[PDB]
Amino acid sequence: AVAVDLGNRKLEISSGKLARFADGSAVVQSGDTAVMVTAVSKTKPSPSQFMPLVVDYRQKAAAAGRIPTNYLRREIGTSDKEILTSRIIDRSIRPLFPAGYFYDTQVLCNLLAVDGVNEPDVLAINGASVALSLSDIPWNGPVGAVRIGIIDGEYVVNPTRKEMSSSTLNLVVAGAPKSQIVMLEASAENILQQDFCHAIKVGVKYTQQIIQGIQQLVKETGVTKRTPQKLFTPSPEIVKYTHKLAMERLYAVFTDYEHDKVSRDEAVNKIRLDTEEQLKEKFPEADPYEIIESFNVVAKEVFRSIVLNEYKRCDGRDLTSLRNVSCEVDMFKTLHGSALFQRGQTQVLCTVTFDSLESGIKSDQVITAINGIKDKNFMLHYEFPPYATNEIGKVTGLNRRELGHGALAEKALYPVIPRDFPFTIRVTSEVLESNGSSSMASACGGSLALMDSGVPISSAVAGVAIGLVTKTDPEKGEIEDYRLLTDILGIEDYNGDMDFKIAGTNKGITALQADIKLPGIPIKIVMEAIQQASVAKKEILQIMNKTISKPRASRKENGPVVETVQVPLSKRAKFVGPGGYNLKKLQAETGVTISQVDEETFSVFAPTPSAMHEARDFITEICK
Amino acid sequence: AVAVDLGNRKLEISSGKLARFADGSAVVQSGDTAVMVTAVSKTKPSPSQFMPLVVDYRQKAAAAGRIPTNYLRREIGTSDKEILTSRIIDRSIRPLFPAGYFYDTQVLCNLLAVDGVNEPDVLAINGASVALSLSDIPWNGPVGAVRIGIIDGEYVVNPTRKEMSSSTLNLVVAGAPKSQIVMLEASAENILQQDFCHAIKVGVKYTQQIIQGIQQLVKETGVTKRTPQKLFTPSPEIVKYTHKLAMERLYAVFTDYEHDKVSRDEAVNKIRLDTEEQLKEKFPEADPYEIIESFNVVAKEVFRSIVLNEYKRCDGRDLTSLRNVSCEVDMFKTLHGSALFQRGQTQVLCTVTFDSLESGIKSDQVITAINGIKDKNFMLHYEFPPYATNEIGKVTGLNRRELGHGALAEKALYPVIPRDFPFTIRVTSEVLESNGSSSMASACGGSLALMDSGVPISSAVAGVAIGLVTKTDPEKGEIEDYRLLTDILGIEDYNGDMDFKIAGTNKGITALQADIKLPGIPIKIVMEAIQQASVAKKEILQIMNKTISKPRASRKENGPVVETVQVPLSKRAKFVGPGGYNLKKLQAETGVTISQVDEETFSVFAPTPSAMHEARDFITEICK
Amino acid sequence: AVAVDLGNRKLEISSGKLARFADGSAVVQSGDTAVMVTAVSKTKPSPSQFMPLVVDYRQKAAAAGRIPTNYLRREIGTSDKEILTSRIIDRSIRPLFPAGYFYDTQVLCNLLAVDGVNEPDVLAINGASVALSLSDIPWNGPVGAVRIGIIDGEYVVNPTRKEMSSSTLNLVVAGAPKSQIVMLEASAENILQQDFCHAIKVGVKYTQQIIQGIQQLVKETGVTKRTPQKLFTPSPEIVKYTHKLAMERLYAVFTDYEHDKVSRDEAVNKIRLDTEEQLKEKFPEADPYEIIESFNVVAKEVFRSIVLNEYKRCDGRDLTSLRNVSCEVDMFKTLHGSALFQRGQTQVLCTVTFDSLESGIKSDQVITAINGIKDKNFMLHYEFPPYATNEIGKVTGLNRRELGHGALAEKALYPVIPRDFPFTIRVTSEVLESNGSSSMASACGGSLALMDSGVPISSAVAGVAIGLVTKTDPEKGEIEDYRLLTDILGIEDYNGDMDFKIAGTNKGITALQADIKLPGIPIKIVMEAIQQASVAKKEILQIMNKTISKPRASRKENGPVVETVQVPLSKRAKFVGPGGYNLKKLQAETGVTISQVDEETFSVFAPTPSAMHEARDFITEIC
User: What is the dihedral of CA A450, A456, A459, A460, to 10 degrees?
Assistant: First the structure.
């Protein structure tokens, strides 16, 4: 039992009492909130040639707060914010696993108790760090996680629920030993860059205090790590031979600036087929997968050597050069708002829909105290269809990535959404083509569609993703020199070291999500990434402003119409029908929804004026 | 961009703007309704031994200007209107793929915008044809699709929603080049055969104009088809050796009229086990699947040659003979209505249940999944349990075929269902045994169970399936000769060319679904099939009328009751409970349904008099 | 075709009319309720290397066939009441399949008609027996099943729905020929042990009459059984050889009382891996599964020989001794009630949550009917996370076992739950570690957490699982001798003959579920198990009473409260908002629920007193 003091807060870490069967287990308590995290890793290598790691964060201690009816129904009971928390924990611990650790691993977080004051999400990240540190699962170094808020100008570590309601910043920092950064997740209320950077500095300092506390617990316990029967990394002598066979062929492909996404991939795969052939007879005893990963190591190394040595990219861009950006608005007449944003070979179509404020809400499956009500009556739905990458996939449900990307784009656009808007705003972003940051293009395209729909947003929001290529020595593991890339392609994200997605208006920052694939990066690189992204964001906003610079003076004339109709007490029963039958039928046949305002007035909402006059005669016949 | 004038309608076809990574893509716009269809096909052969083709038509709510109304504010699950549209598109495009194209293929439809006037389902069929035509996927000639309705005695091409509500016919025709027919899907208000037949030729004439426009677009934008890695068809020399090995044994099996479904299958499989083992010895280097497919081709060729050369079928019937038909009603006392319909070895049990009117409108927002309404308060649920074929399979969820068969049998019976029936009519049809058209037996047994239940349907409805065996010219590809079969078995559907399911009253046609396996058939074959099924339908109605010829004068004594109760204002609070809690508790432990029709009076629906007795007991004791 | 008379009740069994394509089909009718059951078994050996058997009891309507629900199955799925019936049917027919019958098999139930009087669940068990009896599937003698209830002191066979509502016992007995018991599943209102044992005697007598009727129907029909392509049982030559290489090593492992669950399994695996290589060399033609299965048979027989010959379990205790029991309550300040029950290496954490009574109903007429309404506003939720056994598994949703264990533990605690409690009571049992009866530990821990939470239960409830090791000669199958084990581990459950779970207070029995793996056991063995478990249950209640002996004087001061607020007619519209937006906005902000009770009265339920302060701020702000 170790206590770590974080300012006025206290973090208690325990182990050895609950779930002694699991490979690692820990209980993290802050105030009267306790989170229990376990880690399990199979000793038999998985058939798949990657690291299968699943993180699941649940609130099963309340039985989901209700009684879901069926097994299939239970596949939806998992809350949205529980999926988002699992994604944050996953990105905090994934980079620290050893390379070639192809073993099925599961990290489970169980909310023992919640006091409604201390947020359990930050405790879950620390619990995952302690559980892996105390387990025999090889995992490099503990990580500490804190949430930084800005309340009336002060910087608060791990703010309570009440403090978060008055904070202009919601930043979560995961830090590795010697002040490295492994995860960043922020949601700011259009705050200045300097204020944002200072909060990262304060947060990283606090995570180091957690790391030394966890390190004290590890020494007291006496953790011993397992020896995996095989770490699946290509032997250096086969990688070296692959380098000889494909160095020049791969270099020519990557220095050819005429390639597009498909042409470059076909060119690389054409080399892969030729090299993987001769590699087989030279090394007959090599594993079939080992040959594939040997080529992927060489192709990645050649790709990184070009940008490091020559300060040029595979499509001829310089380090700070954007892709071609084109925008359109109002492409379909019947949509309330529409925009088509293209960034290189990434294409996103954004739609805006309006609805009643009281629409939704009456859903009965409120497993928590969670219903259709959002903070500003604003939500963003993100969809990534399989044809965006010329792929085949089922369209049943939203996977974790689509739900995570939608929340990120929603965070980016949230601070500029107005209050007291008469309608519920829903923005739908559909990725038609994907070669880059469709997540950030949903913020730019969503911004354009919001102005095109006539929503009076305070400012336009643009996002961009910053990549990173580093040179790291094998004797120390320190970063010697590095390059930051503006508006990375898909191959630069795949062969890079991070996907630093950051969005905001022309004067401030609204959202950030850093997905670092390295085992930590210095704070210096993070500060420069925010600055480099600031210049790119201004350039994107200038292109967007040419297409549309301000919201339209009014909504489209073919949009929703809201007004009241009177029904006296005498004719109330016939109008609503037996048990509200007539109103329910009207909502079924036509989209018109009728709600009771006062004892004698009903508010009629019609999604289109065409659907309005259709239901106008329906209430006329009822009124007889 | 190509424009097609379909009478007073307009069709706009475009490509090359949206979703450029997909193998094929197209946008089809009529009026203000736009649909985007993409087609993706893998270049690597599928592990399965067939063509996996999936069509997923999505009715996204953003296109219609509505926000999903559950607590997640996002659409969950698949609606039954989307499944039916996916089946029509699948029926229109599947026959045109080359034989042996064992590659994973997905066609996706995205509703860009809908104006509430032009129906997007027909546009999605044309969009799938354009996307496949412009892609590199090997696909035969373009397909044009139109909807024909009869409004005030006039034929209208692609009627709007307003005209579709007043039409007596809803026919969808998909045509191939040279006026062939690849898909027919109609529901009619018991219209005459002549009027139905004229609409098919009017529709086919319009689909040729669409094909003309699509071919112009294909010419303008160059299309080069891919060369598949290989086409999985059995070698002609291997097939000819199988014929010399099993033609005589297979001929004896199919001329043995004492067989039933199971014994004939055992006899055929007995020949297959002897022949395939000899085939492996003769062709050791042949593909294991090539052996299986070569026998299937030889068995199909022998089976069809008997019908063509001798006009006699495998069970001894001639081309127009029905199977044995047996009907029975009043199976169980507690059922509101029931019927057991036997057609050869196909056995169907149909049940009628009278539900409350309120349960008909499940469209209310309470559903976390999707739900809607039915025009008349009539619906049919069709079950195909695994034991109907003596096999083991999943029984819970998501069987598109069950949904398609239920919708077909439902629209067959819909025209005769009375209006203003005081209850919701739910018909459940379970296939206890299947050796043929259980979907049409569901229509026959559904009408028997409806008359037995006491529903005053206007006329009895019977359905039948018409098969087809053709002798196609090997080179030219036209039909040299053909035979039409009445009331086909399962084997004649599987080894045939079409499953022409058509139902109707003795004086008209109510439903039609033609499942053509050929790459198009002439209109003269369709016309003869409709006439041949007219003769069979009268014969079936003659047998069914012997069991029961008119609806029973009243519903069964154990049927549902509706009557109102009176509660005073003082006892209203105790009766209803806090937030209507005591009401929801009463209808959950009794099965009744209580609705408030006035301040003082409540209406009570009970499925049985015993259920009403218990509810009456609770009402009086709560009132005192 | 055959009629079986059970007292004042009648059972009509028929076949040969419906679903003639299935391998076996039967219709069982009692009164005006008819159930059709089919049985299909593939002739191709499945690659699963075990017996794939799935039973799907599907009903067409809820509320005793009064609210249709079958059309919703594509979107909603299968209700839990259908899963529980499918498990009862599965337990009755699974042990009678021959060993090595590795063929995919499905039993499907179709409620052709229900009258709202006779329960179709009992008919489905009989129908599954008749369908398998008339089929060509190799399956042992017919199984009869009845339900026994106690109404005003008398014993009633197959009681109607009205009778079951006034019964103090709900016992389902599935009997094999020669008065063997195959399945036992009961829930009682804390009835005496003597009354419980007599009902089992009455039930087995009735199941023998049903078996006579089925045997008559089989003879008339003329059933001939298929010959399966192969029966996957290890050859005696290789089973004997495995006994030669691994008997002494396995004997030492099972006589080492210093082992725990993990270490004992590792030691057996060490012998197994060493034995597999020797077996493969000695029998190169042997199938890979045959090598594996021979070791499992030899290890199982060595394990049982120690209990039979030496009367000592693998962890050193005698046949009656319990494992170490440790209880702990009130571990987290914010939980309404909590308890951590430890029994050997099994650890369960139980939590009590008070919710509003309004949360009981789903407010959708059909969906509320599907899952029903818990009678005392009490439910138990059982979770078996994958880390409880140091494995990785799917997390969302509950498997069949989790639903069954939750229903069993809720039945055990139901009789002591008080009536007219102001709040809905939800108990969550989470298995942190598993080495034995976590389902019965959920009953003990749930009782501790309920007294800790301040719920005035009538008495504490404890459960236990009784094992069985028998020695039967292969010729006849009768039981020469047997040992009954108290509080079995996982290895003794796995290598044993039954998992006899029974729970109750110190003066009665509230729940029972017997999972017999033999093809029936004598009734005298069952009666000894009940008595032996009553002594063990006494020892557990003595330990639990030391931790907490009576419910706390009142609920925790941070628990939920319910109070009323008066809003006038003039302020009603503003308070609720147009379309009830304000009430649901307050619910989404603070978690409180406001329900209108009269014209002026609104009842507010708040999870915490602080949450009610936030709600009260809104109420006065509007007014």
Answer: 10
Question: With an 8 Å Cβ cutoff, is A420 touching chain C?
Answer: no
Judge: C387–A38 Cβ closer than 8 Å, yes or no: yes
Resolution in A: 2.4
Rounded-to-integer distance, Cα A350 and Cα A429, Å: 4
Q: Would the CB atoms of B358 and A333 count as touching at under 8 Å?
A: no
User: Are B355 and C68 an interchain contact pair (Cβ–Cβ within 8 Å)?
Assistant: yes
Technique used: cryo-EM
Helical axes C438-453 vs C523-547, angle rounded to 10°: 40
Of all helices (H) and strands (E), which one includes residue C176? strand C169-176
Q: Which of A71, A367, A398, A432 to mutate to test the interface with B (most CBs of B within 10 A)?
A: A432
Phi, psi of C3 (to 5 degrees): -115, 130
| Cα–Cα distance measured from residue C42 to residue C23, given in angstroms and rounded to the nearest whole number | 9
Q: Do A379 and B73 touch (CB under 8 A)?
A: yes
Pick the CATH number of A561-623 from 3.10.580.10, 3.30.1370.10, 3.40.50.970, 2.130.10.10: 3.30.1370.10
Domain ranges, ordered by start, for chain B? 2-220, 234-313, 317-557, 561-623
Test B40 with A334 for CB contact under 8 angstroms.
no
Alpha carbons B8 and B5: distance in angstroms, whole number: 7
Q: What is the distance between the alpha carbons of residues C469 and B613, in angstroms, rounded to a whole number?
A: 53
* Contact call for residues B94 and B53 (beta carbons, < 8 A): yes
Calculate the CA A541 to chain-centre distance: 22
Give ∠ CA C173-C176-C179 in degrees, rounded to 5: 85
Confirm or reject contact between A53 and chain B (CB < 8 A).
no
Which residues of chain A have a CB within 8 Å of the CB of B594?
A: 579
In whole angstroms, give the CA distance from residue A336 to residue B66. Answer: 10
Restricting to B residues 429-458, those with a Cβ less than 8 Å away from any Cβ of C are 430, 432-434
The SS3 call for residue C158 is coil
Those residues with Cβ within 8 angstroms of residue B167's Cβ, 6 or more apart along the chain or in another chain = B149, B150, B151, B156, B159
Residue B556, token pair as written in the block: 């069964």
Nearest-by-Cβ selection for C387 from A21, A66, A77:
A21
Of the candidates C425, C443, C429, the one whose C-alpha atom is nearest the C-alpha of residue C379 is C425
Topology classification of domain B2-220:
Ribosomal Protein S5; domain 2 (3.30.230)
Q: Is C296 exposed, middle or buried (0-12, 13-18, 19+ CB in 10 A)?
A: middle
CA–CA distance, C162 with B610 (Å, rounded to integer): 12
Cβ <8 Å between C595 and B584: no
- Strands B154-157, B169-176: parallel, antiparallel or unpaired by DSSP? unpaired
Mutation for B interface: A334, A374, A595, most B CBs within 10 A: A334
Which residue on chain B is closest to A571 by alpha carbon?
A: B598
Interchain pair A67, C379: CB under 8 A:
yes
Residues on chain B touching A589 (C-beta within 8 angstroms): 373
Q: Which of B313, B122, C301, C583 is CA-nearest to residue A369?
A: C583
Q: What's the CATH superfamily of A318-554?
A: GHMP Kinase, N-terminal domain (3.30.230.70)
* A and B: number of Cβ contacts within 8 A: 178
Query: Quick one: which H or E segment has residue B411?
Result: helix B400-413
Count of Cβ atoms closer than 10 Å to residue B506 Cβ: 16
Beta strands A105-113 and A53-58 are: parallel
Same fold, C234-313 and C561-622: no
* Contact residues for C395 (Cβ-Cβ < 8 A; gap 6+): A56, A58, A108, C385, C386
Find, among C30, C70, C65, C59, the residue nearest to B607 by Cα: C65
How many Cα atoms within 13 Å fall on the side-chain side of residue C466? Answer: 24
